RNA sequence: CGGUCCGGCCGGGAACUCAAAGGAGACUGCCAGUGAUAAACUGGAGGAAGGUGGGGAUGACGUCAAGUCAUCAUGGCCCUUACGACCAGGGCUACACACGUGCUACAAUGGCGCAUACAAAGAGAAGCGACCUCGCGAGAGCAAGCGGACCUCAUAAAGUGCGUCGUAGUCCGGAUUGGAGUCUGCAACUCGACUCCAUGAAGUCGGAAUCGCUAGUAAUCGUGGAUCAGAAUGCCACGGUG
């Protein structure tokens, strides 16, 4: 049918880059290829008060960006199926595979 | 007046995280203890092992802990004596496997949590504060630092009136963001209280 | 125009004319006129004397005017006797309800004395 | 915080696992079937009997290193003060300063 | 083929179509009239349709999602003036002059911390 | 107040209303449960509620029912 | 204003005669930023003054206008311990933002039935000068011709 | 473009809106005036942007023995069958007053009823919870989808159209209290939030004095979040008109 692949990480410059990974190995064992789609990055805000007593108006505040990739691959041909899975990504990034 | 933490404001710019792994809002904070409890473990066990830096990444369902050290001999053992020890320990701690690597720390005259310690523990001996700073100074100088900075914070040689010293030589741009400044921190426990230790070394800017 | 509690409703619209009443608001005036069969938006003229009645027929269902003041009355004096919290801070004229005393308690406090 | 209010805690998770998890829970619901039982149950009865630390309602969420019971973020399992100490080192994955 | 202008104001965006014949107006599947319900919104639309004429010279289809009356409408104005310098590109000189060809970079500014507002501080006391 | 599924009485203090019954009426029933709504199985009864320091003996009425038992205990002393 | 020397926005014309002195008045009546609700007001209340005054909706505002309008002004202003009131002559485009702000101010101090008949009572009033408006270029007058020696 | 249940809904199209990675662009660079031919300023051209274009982060040596031993850490001191520890009930919510910060008002630039156009940014599995059904309602029962540009919270409100009230302590304003309830939670008396019915305080614009804000700002109008079983007029954040 088709394969799905949901990337997520907290760095962008390691995300396109294991996702170029997985583009690359797709189209050259065979493959279509469709994206690197890039979805929505889903920053989660954060406000901490920066003194340890009194102080309201000095404070911190820091983000988590959780950026979105999504590969899909049409043809799940058996030179591409083996080669992406005993493929060597990078730790931080989460894959998500959907039949 | 208060000054941004050198390493936190550089993080993304010139400076890498010490965690690098990813896990959503479930698994975040119980990841966190868990990181706490293996550095925790860790800093303690290899105190006189001179560890530097703590890398924590979190490969599927496994831990992958890199211990950056200037005594990388000491950390490893008889042939992987004190590693299997360790790792064998961090995998209770996590609940997952554990994996171990050692990175060699070179020049640790270059390493802000290193000369920190070295502060640190030589006023815990009883040695004069302006000569451990003097000699952290020289020693990251004469090995091409671009600039160092040392602070020593409170009750200095056991005087009653806490005092806030410093030494600077070189260059030192806080407030480039492209410069590679390495900042650290540590505490003396002395007879008479905690003298905490600043290291700001610029190495350069990109 | 004579309703019910003796009041005199004034010459306005039939919705607003019945809120004069103590014990109808403005869900029983809706309530009221729709079971007499009279329009909301009509005043007290044209509104004849077999309008009027219909409605006082209508309004007699329920406790309004003296006969709801009394019954008020009693439910205060009943938690006065009882002794209970709600009935200590209607004898002390202080917020029964739980709301703070150590400042803004003015309407049932009243005005301040130094 | 206190090292008896930290245990105080321990004993507030142990007893919300053993009990209003898989025992308490079944009482509850059997307290809201409408269709079964409408005044002999004793179960709102039988949810006093057992002990008052196992509802996970009192329980209360406190900073995982100092205990602190103030100041607590779910994301991080930590204290506002101790959230900062282990951002500024880098310690929170993908947690930096930011301005838009 | 259709001469074609992005317009964009605030958090809206607009696309503007240009196909010459008649003076209809259509946007979002909707009239001109039955979209905006002030006359003040519906000028500005017609605005670069007054320098380079039009009464019955060309068409524009017109869709525009996210921010608000005036938003929109001077999102709008700007796509129409960008479909006309795609139809023509010596229409510059007069759409300068008016100051249409400008986007309006002024967005609403961010609520900062210990203030009220975006600038509005809380009220100060001496004692 | 709370929803007309039940009202709430403690266990402890319904067992000392209905030996209070049975055996008939004794001193000062010392209770804690303030929380305890009354029941027409109380009225006659002399029920001592505590305040946090003492217990202040209530005489339970017929118009008693359906109140809490800490609404006939003050709490607060203000003079 | 201690250092940069600043000019002034120029806002864009009335959407009904194209004036940009109505513009300014509309802004002037204007409040917690309802434009559309603003000139509601401003062009209901110059529909009844025209039709009750003899057509002329621009010059009919002129007429109210020209007699609130204030020629000279004082200016505070502390030498030694004293404070002095210097007259001073406004600027054209101030003479008109005055003229304005008080016939909005003195309209709403009105008691009649709405804003609209208020502003265009308070217009009928300026243009036949027998109003609060006026009396406000009156009084302002008055302060100047007294402190004439301070000029 | 082909097909219509007239819904991007389905083949499709990669144009556009948008999403997010990389890149270009603005430097007094050009022209003119002022200015010691300098720095610079002013005006103009081109340009989406013009003189640090807008906003943020970034806070030097130091000052106040300024704040925090109650986040944590720690020298010294003090308690150690008690200053430790467990439990139930109470208190932190008291109320002659005074001050500081806020919310809601005193109304027709407004109240109410019906109809109706246009956002942005967030949150979510011990969760957000549709549709359907029951209740005037808060809610309840039943039960999809969704770890989410897909599903859900969630109808943006100002505004606009029509009708009504007609300067009245009022169809303004909602305090206070009475009666009955809903939900969360072992448990809502002290001391929760919300609903229904009834009640309808003060207040008709605030003395002396005083505060914020220079532009998408003020003013006003809604929206979301953190904490959180439940408990926002506070705080943090978001766009609309302006
Ligand atoms: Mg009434
Ligand atoms: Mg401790
Ligand atoms: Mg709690
Ligand atoms: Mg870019
Ligand atoms: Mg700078
Ligand atoms: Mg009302
Ligand atoms: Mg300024």
């Given at each position: ?99 | ?206 | ?114 | ?44 009865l039988?949810?006093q ?52 | ?127 | ?7 709430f009485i403690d266990l402890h203090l319904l067992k000392k209303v209905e030996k209070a ?8 029933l010392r209770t804690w449960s303030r929380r305890s709504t009354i029941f027409?199985?109380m009225?006659?009864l002399?029920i001592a509620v505590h ?18 038992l ?10 | ?151």
């Amino acid at each position: 049918q088709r394969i799905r692949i949901r990337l997520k990480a907290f760095d962008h410059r390691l995300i396109d880059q294991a996702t170029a990974e997985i583009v690359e190995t797709a189209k050259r064992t065979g493959a279509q290829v469709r994206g690197p789609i890039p979805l929505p990055t889903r920053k989660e805000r954060f406000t901490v008060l920066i003194s340890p007593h009194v102080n309201k108006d000095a404070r911190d505040q820091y983000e988590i960006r959780t950026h979105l990739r999504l590969v899909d691959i049409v043809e799940p041909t058996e030179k591409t199926v083996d080669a992406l899975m005993r493929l060597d990504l990078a730790a931080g990034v989460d894959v998500q595979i959907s039949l | 007046g208060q000054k941004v933490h050198p390493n936190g404001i550089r993080l993304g710019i010139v400076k890498p995280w010490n965690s690098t792994w990813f896990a959503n809002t479930k698994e975040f904070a119980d990841n966190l203890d868990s990181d706490f409890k293996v550095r925790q473990y860790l800093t303690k066990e290899l105190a006189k092992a001179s560890v530097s830096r703590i890398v924590i990444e979190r490969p599927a369902k496994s831990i992958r802990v890199t211990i950056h050290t200037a005594r990388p001999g000491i950390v490893i053992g008889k042939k992987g004596e004190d590693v299997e020890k360790l790792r064998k320990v961090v995998a209770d701690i996590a609940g997952v496997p554990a994996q171990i690597n050692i990175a060699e720390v070179r020049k640790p005259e270059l390493d802000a949590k290193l000369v920190a310690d070295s502060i640190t523990s030589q006023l815990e001996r009883r040695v004069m504060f302006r000569r451990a700073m003097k000699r952290a100074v020289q020693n990251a100088m004469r090995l091409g630092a671009k600039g160092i900075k040392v602070e020593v914070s409170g009750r200095l040689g056991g005087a009653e009136i806490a005092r806030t010293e410093w030494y600077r030589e070189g260059r030192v741009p806080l407030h480039t963001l492209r410069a590679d400044i390495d900042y650290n921190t540590s505490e003396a426990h002395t007879t008479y209280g905690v003298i905490g230790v600043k290291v700001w070394i610029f190495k350069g800017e990109i | 125009a004579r309703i019910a509690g003796i009041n005199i409703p004034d010459h306005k619209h039939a919705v607003i004319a019945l809120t004069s009443i103590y014990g109808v608001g403005k869900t029983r005036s809706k309530a009221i006129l729709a079971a007499a069969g009279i329009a909301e938006d009509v005043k007290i003229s044209e509104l004849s004397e077999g309008q009027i009645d219909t409605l006082r027929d209508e309004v007699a269902k329920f406790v309004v005017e003296g006969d709801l003041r009394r019954e008020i009355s009693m439910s205060i004096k009943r938690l006065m006797d009882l002794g209970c919290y709600r009935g200590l801070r209607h004898r002390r004229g202080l917020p029964v309800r739980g709301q703070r005393t150590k400042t803004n308690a003015r309407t049932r406090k009243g005005p301040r004395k130094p | 915080a206190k090292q008896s209010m930290k245990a105080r805690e321990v004993k507030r998770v142990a007893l919300a696992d053993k009990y209003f998890a898989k025992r308490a829970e079944l009482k509850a619901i059997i307290s809201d079937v409408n269709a079964s039982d409408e005044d002999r149950w004793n179960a709102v009865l039988k949810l006093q009997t057992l002990p008052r630390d196992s509802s996970p309602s009192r329980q209360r969420n406190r900073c995982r290193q100092t205990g602190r019971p103030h100041g607590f973020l779910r994301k991080f399992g930590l204290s506002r003060i101790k959230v900062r100490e282990a951002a500024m080192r880098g310690e929170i994955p993908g947690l930096k300063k930011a301005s838009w | 083929n259709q001469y074609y202008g992005t317009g964009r104001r605030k958090s809206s965006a607009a696309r503007v179509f240009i196909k010459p014949g008649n003076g209809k107006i259509v946007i979002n599947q909707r009239s001109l009239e039955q979209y905006f319900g002030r006359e003040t919104a519906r000028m500005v639309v017609r605005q670069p349709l007054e320098l380079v004429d039009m009464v019955e010279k060309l068409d524009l289809y017109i869709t525009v999602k996210g921010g608000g009356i005036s938003g929109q409408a001077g999102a709008i104005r700007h796509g129409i003036t960008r479909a006309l310098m795609e139809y023509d590109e010596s229409l510059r000189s007069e759409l300068r002059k008016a100051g249409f060809v400008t986007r309006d970079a002024r967005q609403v500014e961010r609520k900062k911390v210990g203030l009220r507002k975006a600038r509005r501080r809380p009220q100060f006391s001496k004692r | 107040r709370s929803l007309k599924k039940g009202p709430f009485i403690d266990l402890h203090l319904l067992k000392k209303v209905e030996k209070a019954v049975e055996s008939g009426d004794k001193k000062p029933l010392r209770t804690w449960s303030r929380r305890s709504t009354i029941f027409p199985n109380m009225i006659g009864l002399t029920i001592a509620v505590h305040n946090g320091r003492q217990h202040v003996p209530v005489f339970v009425t017929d118009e008693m029912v359906g109140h809490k038992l800490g609404e006939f205990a003050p709490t607060r002393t203000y003079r | 204003p201690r250092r940069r020397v600043i000019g002034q926005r120029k806002i864009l014309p009335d959407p009904k005669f194209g004036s940009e002195l109505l513009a300014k008045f509309v802004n002037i009546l204007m409040v917690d930023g309802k434009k559309s609700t603003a000139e509601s007001i401003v062009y209901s209340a110059l529909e009844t003054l025209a039709q009750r005054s003899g057509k002329s909706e621009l010059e009919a505002f002129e007429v109210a206008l020209e007699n609130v309008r204030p020629t000279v002004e004082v200016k505070s202003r502390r030498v030694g311990g004293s404070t002095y009131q210097v007259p001073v002559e406004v600027r054209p485009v101030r003479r008109n933002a005055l003229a304005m702000r008080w016939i909005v101010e003195a309209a709403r101090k009105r008691g009649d039935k709405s804003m609209a008949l208020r502003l265009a009572n308070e217009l009928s009033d300026a243009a036949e000068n027998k109003g609060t408006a006026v009396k406000k270029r009156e009084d302002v007058h008055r302060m100047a011709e007294a402190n004439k020696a301070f000029a």
